[PDB]
Write a protein that binds this ligand. Structure first.
Ligand SMILES: NCC[C@@H](C(=O)N/N=C/c1ccc(O)c(Br)c1)c1ccccc1
Lengths: 19, 337
């Protein structure tokens, strides 16, 4: 499932802004 | 009317915009309590104002680090804009000052923690829960944009939940006052409109795209475009093919297809009817916009508040000594702060 893919991804933590 | 409210709002804003408050407190007036969050060039701390006993969030920015990251002008934008605006869902800047080493922005403390925290823990919000928060962003963006301001960093990490369960938008680091278009590649990957990524030059319509991303993420529990690395995220955004969970209502999908619209001549928020294409969309049929602004609607979720200056709704961060050099740093660059 997409949810499972998200949860296993490296970007479920706080996401930093880019400059 | 809305137009009348906005016209008056603009008049107040321009006065402060043209004459910004400056040097309105000093470090020694605050007792430092706890780090609530961190950023590339500083930290936000819970502090207590000694003379009133009030609690505030003090954003401390290291001048030298701001300079190294080429965020001088963005930082000046942030403070100048933040000190000037006034909207129910915008966090209030109470004081600002600087010393030899740092810039300081002392803001209202929002005890309920980040939407990010609650969203991740719970998984996803129901459509009515997501609609409640979304409406507040719709109005906030209507307000900001009427002031020629682009917010440019919408994400759950920047939306705090207050004691009544309403949203407070924080982090104006990328906010900018601009008539027409701008070009700075800034923001957070998941939330960037295609036109930002493509260096096309862009306007307020990027905030309406970002809204589309926020509503999707709130309702699905994950963003419409994610991957392990930013470059992969951009490829997904640019193609713009969006798949919706099977639990998304027909109205929700229709709204999202109009917000996550690559075609600027078709993106909701950006058309002749402006924000009204959104306010009047079927998904918002049950939304009473005035009740929202008035904070009369019952919130789907009220944060637990164990007391004054309690931090239970925030993550723990490593504490560092706030050091102030005996020499002034970067005085010229931040003279206007
Ligand atoms: N988006 C990265 C967080 C960014 C930022 O501005 N955070 N603000 C948090 C804040 C404001 C008012 C509150 O009452 C509460 Br509680 C929290 C940042 C932080 C440190 C340095 C640079 C940017």
């Amino acid at each position: 499932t997409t949810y499972a893919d998200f949860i296993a991804s490296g970007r479920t933590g706080r996401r930093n802004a880019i400059h | 009317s809305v137009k009348e409210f906005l016209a008056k709002a603009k008049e107040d804003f321009l006065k402060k915009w043209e004459s910004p408050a400056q040097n309105t407190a000093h470090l020694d007036q605050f007792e430092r309590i706890k780090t609530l969050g961190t950023g590339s060039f500083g930290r936000v701390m819970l502090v207590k104002h000694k003379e009133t006993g009030n609690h505030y969030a003090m954003k401390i920015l290291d001048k030298q680090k701001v300079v190294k990251l080429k965020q001088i002008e963005h930082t000046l934008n942030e403070k100048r804009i933040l000190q000037a605006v006034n909207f129910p869902f915008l966090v209030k800047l109470e004081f600002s000052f600087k010393d030899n080493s740092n810039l300081y922005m002392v803001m209202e403390y929002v005890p309920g923690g980040e939407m990010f925290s609650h969203l991740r823990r719970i998984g996803r919000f129901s459509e009515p829960h997501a609609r409640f928060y979304a409406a507040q962003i719709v109005l906030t963006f209507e307000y900001l944009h009427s002031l020629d301001l682009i917010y440019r960093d919408l994400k759950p990490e920047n939306l705090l939940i207050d004691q009544q369960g309403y949203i407070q938008v924080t982090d104006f680091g990328f906010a900018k006052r601009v008539k027409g278009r701008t070009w700075t590649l800034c923001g957070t990957p998941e939330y960037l409109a295609p036109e930002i990524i493509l260096s096309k030059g862009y306007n307020k319509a990027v905030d309406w795209w970002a809204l589309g991303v926020l509503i999707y993420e709130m309702a699905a529990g994950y963003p419409p475009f994610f991957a392990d690395q930013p470059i992969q995220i951009y490829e997904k955004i640019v193609s713009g093919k969006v798949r919706f969970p099977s639990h998304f209502s027909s109205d929700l999908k229709d709204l999202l297809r109009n917000l996550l619209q690559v075609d600027l001549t078709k993106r909701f928020g950006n058309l002749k009817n402006g924000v009204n294409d959104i306010k009047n969309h079927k998904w918002f049929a049950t939304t009473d916009w005035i009740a929202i602004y008035q904070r009369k609607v019952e919130a789907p979720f009220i944060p637990k508040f164990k007391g004054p200056g309690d931090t239970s709704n925030f993550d723990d961060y490593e504490e560092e000594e706030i050091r102030v050099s005996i020499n002034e740093k970067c005085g010229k660059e931040f003279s206007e702060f």
